[PDB]
């Protein structure tokens, strides 16, 4: 849905709005999202706990170990390859 | 014959009267005992029978409107008779000497002393020796003891043991009258510690709760118990705190409830509009954390501490602790008070101990609010040794010293505003880096955040005073001048501020 | 036999009536006074025994509806008697003559002079020369003292003297007394300043603040103290200041509690809707300004002062100090009392020196609310002097004289309104 304010070459040049940045990987889609972005859209879908999501999430490997602002800048997502095309990677 | 006065005889049959016929006039009607509140003025009276039934009434009840009441209470009374019964029961108290009485549980605060309050209560040596006369209490729980000690202490061993959460947990609850004790004897200036257990749902939290708080009476849901809910209004959670100084409760799951006032409420014994007055210690419970939506306030991190780890190890450990603490409660903090009693000089060295090992283990902390938890860990081993001897089991303080000085490092952050602040900061501009020009000039034709410059090892962001003030509303920060204060002492920092920010950001901000 | 009327009785064993046989009706119930509201017209009166408890009831209390009441405050009645009863302690309290109650604390006005209530009562030279009564006051708090003097001082000494702001701490505190005794005399106009302890979490402001009320009375939380939380209504905060006026009172911790309209309330003796009237000194504690979420008046900067250092020099600094208050309280504010009342224009005389000394410190001042402050500088200063001879230690002068010409200096362009709004039009701009 906000595809449009998350960049491809590393640097946040969305002059309205930034979320994040978001690089097509082997077999995999790494979403950087900025870590108040992802507060507060966790907050709008009515999750009540940031960090309770964020370990469940790391659990399954979809954080990932140790990059990333995790539970004890960016979150660091990995999302599945074919979703690729349409989002325009 | 148990009593007369004038014409009027209390017999085990009752009262009666005589006149030129000798008239029943009443069931036995005893008055054991009056006190008299200083402030009010106003008079109170225990009435009994020889059945052992006892109740506390207001003196006004000895009024001739009032006193056919005691019917309700079981009595019998002939009220042809009620003007001269009334005269006969005041007459009784007047013969009674003035006594006192004091309300709560935990520890009592007394001119002559202490008392601790339990189910039954416990006197301590400045008391016992001070007070010619039985002290008289408002039990103010249930807290009687259910089941045995044995099996309290078996499924300890075989459930708790070993298992450092499942342990703190047991400390916690103990804690409440060891920490009370310390504020009495100022050793501490506050009274208790909020806990919070959060972490995910089925994972033993309402468990450890239970288990914490069976040391001193019933951990179920009932009328008069330790187990509660977040389930009322602040007038009745306040309420059912009033006058304890000593016994944990549980607040069981916040979703059955913009929380910054009542966690200071809590850890402070103010009631509101005269006042309720507590000192006690809370478990709280919940599958979210109790610093979400809450004020970025430090003095909120330090009157409070939140475990977000898995209590017990199975579904069979917790399915098997709350059946055990259902049936089994209220052995082991009587065993704490009269340790603290006839051990009272040995702890306070124990609790020196404690607060030195901690200063020392932490003396690279310069922030005011870290030093201030350091007498709060150091209650949390002294109850630890203590409830070591008292159990008669073995339990590793040195595991408990660690959890704590990990528990303080991983919070360093979050007791401070400046990391705290910095952090919302970064992403501010990372985030709105299209309202942040670079050559010089607020060249944003829709609006204009500041200026962005690519500096030697640091990058200078010049942002716009109001900008900057409004962010930190918007994440819960309610003072600038702190936040500002906070963040120019780490050398972070009529228009602008000027914020230096680490190189190493220049390439995602397009530097 | 303590009183008689025609067939009423009062002995040291209680009440009795006779006629053509003698019966007992009552404990020992005594009337020892009378009091008479002018625009209610309603009557009140004391009621004891012999055994010195003192208890303040409406004079309905002796209709034969409401006597057996007094049975709740440990008398006892036969009620069989009540109508007689009744009229007995009626006809005792017609032989009594009529007395003025005073109800308050601090400076209590009254049209023979004023009054220093605190535990005890202290009366002035222009009262006690001309009305031929005991004066009789609602005490109104607790302020009984407990422990020594000695400890306080001891504790003044070792972790508060040198130290400047747990100095004015102290100040303050008196201050509250002082600024009504000066109101009082139509030196200031003011009746008292709000006092906001704020800056970052354990700095010593809660510490200070107890420090601060040591001065009259217990510093602790409990049943009846001055040091309470902003938890409760408008109704009871104001509740709790009434008939106040010249006992500091702490309210501690905002977080739990747009506060405009209340730091108003607070420097006028405002209530609401009779009015419960005040007029003292009271010291906030908070981890957040109150002028963070307030208009943007001057006259608001103009009647607080909030103080934005730390207070204490180390956490053992505090924890010493709030041992030694909690232990020791209430002794220094009657030995204040006692000074204005025997060197009152000694400290008038004081307060005028210091008034024209920062008067002329600045005499740059254009802005009307910036000369506002002067004559509130100075009643802190001139506490500091009264302080500095009741404890009878040194106090330096010119460090509090120039902490607040400094105090002043950087407040300066929030007494302006043009320098708030041109700050907010840059960046408006911008
Ligand atoms: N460690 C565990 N592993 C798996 N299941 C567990 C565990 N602990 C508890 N459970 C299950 O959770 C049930 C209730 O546990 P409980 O102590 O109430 O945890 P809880 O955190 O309070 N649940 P909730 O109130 O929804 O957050 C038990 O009866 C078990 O079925
Ligand atoms: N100057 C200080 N330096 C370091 N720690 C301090 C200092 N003053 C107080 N503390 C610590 O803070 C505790 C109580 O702080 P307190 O005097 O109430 O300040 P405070 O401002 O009221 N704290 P808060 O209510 O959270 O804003 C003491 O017991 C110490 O542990
Ligand atoms: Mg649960
Ligand atoms: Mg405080």
Do not use: C
């Not at chain 2, 920490?179 to 257990?197: C, D, V």
């Amino acid at each position: 849905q906000n595809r449009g304010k998350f960049s491809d070459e590393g640097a946040l040049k969305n002059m309205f709005e930034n979320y994040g940045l978001i690089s097509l990987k082997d077999d995999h889609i790494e979403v950087k999202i900025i870590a108040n972005v992802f507060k507060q859209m966790l907050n709008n879908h009515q999750f009540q706990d940031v960090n309770n999501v964020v370990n469940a999430l790391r659990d399954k490997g979809f954080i990932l170990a140790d990059r990333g602002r995790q539970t004890t800048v960016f979150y660091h997502l990995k999302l599945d390859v074919e979703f690729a095309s349409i989002l325009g990677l | 014959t148990l009593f007369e006065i004038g014409p009027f005889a209390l017999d085990s049959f009752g009262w009666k009267e005589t006149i030129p016929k000798v008239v029943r006039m009443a069931s036995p009607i005893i008055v054991n005992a009056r006190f008299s509140d200083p402030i009010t003025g106003v008079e109170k009276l225990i009435i009994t029978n020889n059945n052992g039934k006892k109740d506390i009434f207001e003196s006004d009840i000895l009024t001739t409107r009032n006193l056919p009441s005691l019917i309700k209470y079981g009595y019998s009374i002939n009220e042809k008779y009620i003007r001269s019964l009334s005269y006969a029961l005041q007459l009784m108290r007047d013969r009674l000497p003035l006594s006192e009485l004091y309300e709560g549980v935990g520890i009592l605060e007394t001119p002559f002393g202490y008392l601790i309050s339990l189910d039954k209560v416990l006197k301590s040596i400045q008391f016992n020796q001070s007070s010619p006369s039985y002290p008289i209490v408002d039990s103010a729980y249930d807290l009687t003891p259910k089941g045995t000690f044995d099996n309290w202490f078996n499924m300890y061993i075989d459930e708790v043991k070993g298992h450092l959460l499942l342990e703190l947990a047991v400390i916690f609850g103990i804690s409440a009258l060891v920490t009370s004790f310390l504020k009495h004897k100022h050793e501490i200036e506050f009274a208790g510690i909020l806990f919070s257990f959060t972490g995910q749902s089925s994972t033993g939290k309402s468990t450890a709760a239970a288990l914490a708080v069976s040391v001193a009476g019933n951990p179920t849901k009932g009328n008069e118990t330790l187990f509660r809910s977040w389930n009322a209004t602040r007038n009745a959670l306040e309420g059912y705190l009033s006058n304890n100084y000593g016994i944990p409760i549980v607040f069981d799951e916040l979703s059955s409830t913009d929380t910054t006032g009542l966690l200071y409420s809590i850890a402070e014994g103010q009631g509101r509009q005269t006042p309720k007055n507590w000192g006690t210690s809370v478990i709280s419970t919940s599958e979210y954390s109790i610093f979400n939506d809450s004020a970025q306030n430090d003095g909120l991190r330090v009157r409070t501490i939140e475990i977000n780890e898995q209590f017990t190890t199975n579904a069979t450990n917790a399915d098997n602790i709350k059946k055990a603490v259902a049936l089994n409660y209220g052995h082991v903090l009587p065993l704490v008070a009269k340790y603290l009693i006839n051990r009272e000089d040995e702890v306070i060295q124990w609790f020196y101990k404690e607060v030195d090992w901690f200063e020392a283990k932490l003396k690279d902390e310069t922030n005011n609010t870290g030093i201030r938890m350091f007498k709060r860990y150091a209650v949390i081993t002294t109850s630890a040794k203590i409830l070591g001897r008292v159990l008669s089991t073995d339990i590793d303080i040195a595991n408990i010293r660690d959890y704590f000085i990990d528990y303080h490092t991983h919070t360093v952050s979050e007791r401070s505003l400046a990391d705290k602040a910095i952090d919302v900061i970064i992403q501010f501009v990372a985030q709105n880096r299209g309202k942040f020009s670079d050559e010089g000039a607020l060249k944003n034709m829709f609006e204009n955040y500041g200026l962005i410059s690519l500096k030697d090892d640091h990058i200078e962001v010049k942002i716009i005073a109001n900008v900057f003030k409004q962010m930190l509303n918007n994440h819960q920060f309610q003072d600038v001048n702190n936040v500002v204060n906070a963040l120019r002492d780490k050398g972070f920092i009529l228009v602008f501020y000027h914020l230096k920010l680490d190189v190493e950001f220049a390439s995602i901000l397009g530097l």
